Amino acid sequence: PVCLVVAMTPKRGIGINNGLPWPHLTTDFKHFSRVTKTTPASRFNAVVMGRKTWESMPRKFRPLVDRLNIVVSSSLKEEDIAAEKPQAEGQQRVRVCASLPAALSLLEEEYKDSVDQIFVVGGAGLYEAALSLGVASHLYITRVAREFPCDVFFPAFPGDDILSNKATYRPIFISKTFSDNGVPYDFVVLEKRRSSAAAIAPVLAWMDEELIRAVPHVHFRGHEEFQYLDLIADIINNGRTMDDRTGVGVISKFGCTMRYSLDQAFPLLTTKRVFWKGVLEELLWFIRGDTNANHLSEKGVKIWDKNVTREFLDSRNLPHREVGDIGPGYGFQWRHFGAAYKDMHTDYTGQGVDQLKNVIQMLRTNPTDRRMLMTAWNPAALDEMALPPCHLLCQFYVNDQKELSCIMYQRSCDVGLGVPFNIASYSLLTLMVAHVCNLKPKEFIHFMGNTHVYTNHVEALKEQLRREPRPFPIVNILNKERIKEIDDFTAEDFEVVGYVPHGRIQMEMAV
Amino acid sequence: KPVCLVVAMTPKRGIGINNGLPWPHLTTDFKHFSRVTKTTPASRFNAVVMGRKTWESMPRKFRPLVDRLNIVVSSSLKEEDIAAEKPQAEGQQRVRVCASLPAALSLLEEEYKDSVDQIFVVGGAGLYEAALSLGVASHLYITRVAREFPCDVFFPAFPGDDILSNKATYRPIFISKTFSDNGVPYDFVVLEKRRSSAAAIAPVLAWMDELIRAVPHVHFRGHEEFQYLDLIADIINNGRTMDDRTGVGVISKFGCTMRYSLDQAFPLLTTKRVFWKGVLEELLWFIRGDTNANHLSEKGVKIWDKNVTREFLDSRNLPHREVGDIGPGYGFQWRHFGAAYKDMHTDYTGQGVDQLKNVIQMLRTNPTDRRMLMTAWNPAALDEMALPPCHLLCQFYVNDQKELSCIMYQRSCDVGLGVPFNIASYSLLTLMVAHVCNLKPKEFIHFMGNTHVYTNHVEALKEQLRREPRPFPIVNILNKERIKEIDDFTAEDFEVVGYVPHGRIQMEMAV
Numbered sequence A: 001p002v003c004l005v006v007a008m009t010p011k012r013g014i015g016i017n018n019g020l021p022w023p024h025l026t027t028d029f030k031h032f033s034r035v036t037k038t039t040p041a042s043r044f045n046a047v048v049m050g051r052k053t054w055e056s057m058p059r060k061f062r063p064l065v066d067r068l069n070i071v072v073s074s075s076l077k078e079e080d081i082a083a084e085k086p087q088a089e090g091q092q093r094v095r096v097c098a099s100l101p102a103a104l105s106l107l108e109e110e111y112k113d114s115v116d117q118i119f120v121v122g123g124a125g126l127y128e129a130a131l132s133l134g135v136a137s138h139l140y141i142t143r144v145a146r147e148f149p150c151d152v153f154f155p156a157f158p159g160d161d162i163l164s165n166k167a168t169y170r171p172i173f174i175s176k177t178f179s180d181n182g183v184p185y186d187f188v189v190l191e192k193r194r195s196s197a198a199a200i201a202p203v204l205a206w207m208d209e210e211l212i213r214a215v216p217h218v219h220f221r222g223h224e225e226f227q228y229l230d231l232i233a234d235i236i237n238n239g240r241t242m243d244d245r246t247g248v249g250v251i252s253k254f255g256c257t258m259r260y261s262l263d264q265a266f267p268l269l270t271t272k273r274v275f276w277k278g279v280l281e282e283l284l285w286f287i288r289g290d291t292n293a294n295h296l297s298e299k300g301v302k303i304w305d306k307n308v309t310r311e312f313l314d315s316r317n318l319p320h321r322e323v324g325d326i327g328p329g330y331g332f333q334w335r336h337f338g339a340a341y342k343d344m345h346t347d348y349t350g351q352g353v354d355q356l357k358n359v360i361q362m363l364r365t366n367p368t369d370r371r372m373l374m375t376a377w378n379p380a381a382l383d384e385m386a387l388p389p390c391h392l393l394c395q396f397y398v399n400d401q402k403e404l405s406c407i408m409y410q411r412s413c414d415v416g417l418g419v420p421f422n423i424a425s426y427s428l429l430t431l432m433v434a435h436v437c438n439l440k441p442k443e444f445i446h447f448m449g450n451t452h453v454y455t456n457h458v459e460a461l462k463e464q465l466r467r468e469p470r471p472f473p474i475v476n477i478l479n480k481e482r483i484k485e486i487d488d489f490t491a492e493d494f495e496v497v498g499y500v501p502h503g504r505i506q507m508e509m510a511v
Numbered sequence B: 001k002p003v004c005l006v007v008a009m010t011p012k013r014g015i016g017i018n019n020g021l022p023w024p025h026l027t028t029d030f031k032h033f034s035r036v037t038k039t040t041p042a043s044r045f046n047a048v049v050m051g052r053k054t055w056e057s058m059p060r061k062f063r064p065l066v067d068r069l070n071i072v073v074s075s076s077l078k079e080e081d082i083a084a085e086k087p088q089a090e091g092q093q094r095v096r097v098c099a100s101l102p103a104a105l106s107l108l109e110e111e112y113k114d115s116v117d118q119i120f121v122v123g124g125a126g127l128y129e130a131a132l133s134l135g136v137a138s139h140l141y142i143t144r145v146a147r148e149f150p151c152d153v154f155f156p157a158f159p160g161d162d163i164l165s166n167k168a169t170y171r172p173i174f175i176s177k178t179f180s181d182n183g184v185p186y187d188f189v190v191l192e193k194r195r196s197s198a199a200a201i202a203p204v205l206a207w208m209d210e211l212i213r214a215v216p217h218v219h220f221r222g223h224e225e226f227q228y229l230d231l232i233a234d235i236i237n238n239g240r241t242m243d244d245r246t247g248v249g250v251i252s253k254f255g256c257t258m259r260y261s262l263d264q265a266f267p268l269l270t271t272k273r274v275f276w277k278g279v280l281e282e283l284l285w286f287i288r289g290d291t292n293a294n295h296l297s298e299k300g301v302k303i304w305d306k307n308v309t310r311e312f313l314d315s316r317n318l319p320h321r322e323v324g325d326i327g328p329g330y331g332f333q334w335r336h337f338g339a340a341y342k343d344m345h346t347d348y349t350g351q352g353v354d355q356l357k358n359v360i361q362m363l364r365t366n367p368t369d370r371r372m373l374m375t376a377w378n379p380a381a382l383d384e385m386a387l388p389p390c391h392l393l394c395q396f397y398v399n400d401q402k403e404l405s406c407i408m409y410q411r412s413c414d415v416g417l418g419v420p421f422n423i424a425s426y427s428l429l430t431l432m433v434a435h436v437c438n439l440k441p442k443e444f445i446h447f448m449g450n451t452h453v454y455t456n457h458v459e460a461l462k463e464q465l466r467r468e469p470r471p472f473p474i475v476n477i478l479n480k481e482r483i484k485e486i487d488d489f490t491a492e493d494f495e496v497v498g499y500v501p502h503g504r505i506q507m508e509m510a511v
Ligand SMILES: NC(=O)C1=CN([C@@H]2O[C@H](COP(=O)(O)OP(=O)(O)OC[C@H]3O[C@@H](n4cnc5c(N)ncnc54)[C@H](OP(=O)(O)O)[C@@H]3O)[C@@H](O)[C@H]2O)C=CC1
Pocket: A005, A006, A007, A008, A013, A014, A015, A016, A017, A018, A019, A020, A021, A049, A050, A051, A052, A053, A054, A056, A072, A073, A074, A075, A076, A098, A099, A100, A121, A122, A123, A124, A125, A126, A129, A152
């Protein structure tokens, strides 16, 4: 009964030139350190490594303190290690054996009472050995989300779908995404599968009085994507079947909340590929105050097309609107609130209230002010819009450490399709503002009104809730020096890093 | 050896009148009593104990209480009176009679060991007064009837009867949410006498695993006011200290949620008295679209006075405003969104969007619509306002059973002073709208963006947290038939039933 501890790229790479492939992952080191050391008294833990693995270690850290170090080697002897450095008091002497099966017997022989848990700690030779012999009950894996040049690899195994797209190992633990030196990563654990309260109790018994789950086997649910997945399950389990403007049926709930950290990684949902080109192109479009949808479509982003066709414009009772014109919609209200709309071709510069600019000026000069809001809802103009805004309001907030948070309120949420797009969209806006105001991005908070999954998406979502999420990627702003105002960002000023989502899922847009 | 009291009680400790129950039939209580007295962990059963008159007050079809050993403390009644009262069913226990409760407890030990699990004193004042004297009462199961009723038999006084009203001990360990039957609100409290299966997952939890609590001894926190109390405790412990517009220090968080049911009772917070006359008269003020704060002031509602002084109006750079004119504030945007403001005396009938009309109409005609929103936030008009709206947006929702829910979004939340008032104000509006649309009120959802406590309330709030909440009151709309439109409501048309708050705590308003 042994455990495998590893840090590992999506392609199972683990080393290069007898060393680590990535810059230092401090939190990984701390995690590895804690896992291999902590115990429920008299007992300590055993770390088993290979020669190359022992040798790669900086001399400062070998031998691994408070732990019975063991090396598997044919060519090195117990004296080489005893003479490599002078030993310190309070530790066991490193022991060397022919193979892993041999190295295990040594633990059964001499250390039958001293040690608690055993850990195979590297490298490819030993990990492979343990997998063959099937004594490994658990895998403590650090998924490095970025790809790195490698010559040494972790052997393939049943259930390596947790790494990338293609007696088993199923995930039982998935942590939130951490990042160090511009490298996003997280921790999984895969398991080998193949009367002070008595008085209250019966009162609870009569009170309770009356199905679908996301990745049910995953018990510790650190990953923040669980919010979205538990939110899906919830609506399907406890929603209410409604009719619709569209004619397509709906299961809905009212009043919902997720929030996402922006300091370590970016919440680009990993359980299905998010059309990021679309969120970027559209957010840029918003910020310009552009209301011509053809500018999006010509760039290969057809998200608004169905909602600006000749047919739809007339159902919405706007025969005079050119094909493409979303009326005075989201962008317009951000940049020219309450201005008199004409068409998508008109220049509205200096007109209306520039909510966006005001929000930034306030952020830069008086960040304690509680009137840092931007609204898209304009009662007077709703009829002129092709579609009333879903995400209609956002508030910004700064704390002590110059960390920026953003709340967005959405009236009507398409959970299968719209939500992950809207999460990534406003999380990006936060990064943009944070940079321009000289603030650290902290948190994005999602406030939802009518929250619904369409009945024709239900089949497809059940498939999605079997998928265990991958580590969130990092979004970087490039050209950090060139960009000084919110209007200075372009499509080329960003780079998604480490995005390894699951394959695409087709969902029809309710027209 | 330890005994449990079970009682339904009036705020003034009243339990009976005319050898009967003071209130109409409270069904959930009857269920609660039924299960708590009957349920047992195979061979055993429970014992119930009562005075002669409690046995007499009981309906014939219910006495003796099935599946329980009935025992009556009396000197006039004899055992053969009770046997020759109703034919014995096969499988039951023979009711027993004793001269005193001490003798009753003797009978339990002497003969009924190995037979009875739990013992329950079940009434009336004589026995309850007795059980407290002897000090054998381990737990008191109290149903707190919030309404006052005519009674001639009372529950004895006891240390810890502060759970009922304002003033070896009895401390709460369980407080349930409010239920109501036949216009009677009530809740359930339980008082106490004081005077590597999953272990392989726990090590990675250790380095991830990490000061002020409300009513901590209370472990079951069903009561919905715990939301507010825990929201106070969260900000204080985990909040960040900011400077302020007003100049006073602040502790804060970003955005938090609460939700309150409106089907059983009304979320008029009990742990400190809420100025209901204020909420009611202000809400009506809003509905009218009235911008003259003097109309509030002349009625004894001075909540808007410190923000319409010549001083504040001039500091807000509005010299030409008459004293009392809040500018185009909440009411005005609701009823005349976007209208060109002059002064508080102008008739604006027919100008701007009447958002409130449009919302009611959609509700009454097309309830599955998702654009049923109303906003007070109008960036073009902000500079003309005495104060930018705090609660700036609210959204409605109807489900299967024609039930109405409401969300309100509040950009800035004075947790100590304003939040309780705001919970009451939109919950009241939700009752009002439901009545006019012919709907059942279901739920009020509070989204607050920036949530804070003022540092000159921290002492007053820590005090408040020691207080445990009382049952919520029922708010009734009187003269239903007359009121057909939102404007038909007047101050007299509301009745607050069963409100028993804790003492008023003085908290000043920051200008
Ligand atoms: N990312 C991660 O989590 C980890 C990465 N690494 C990386 O991997 C590399 C080191 O591992 P790797 O290069 O695979 O070398 P290994 O650590 O697998 O050890 C190889 C040597 O050890 C002996 N050995 C190994 N396996 C066996 C076996 N089953 N039976 C008998 N002897 C055995 C052999 O000695 P002989 O030749 O005398 O027979 C062999 O030459 C480094 O680049 C390191 O950075 C290492 C540990 C963890």
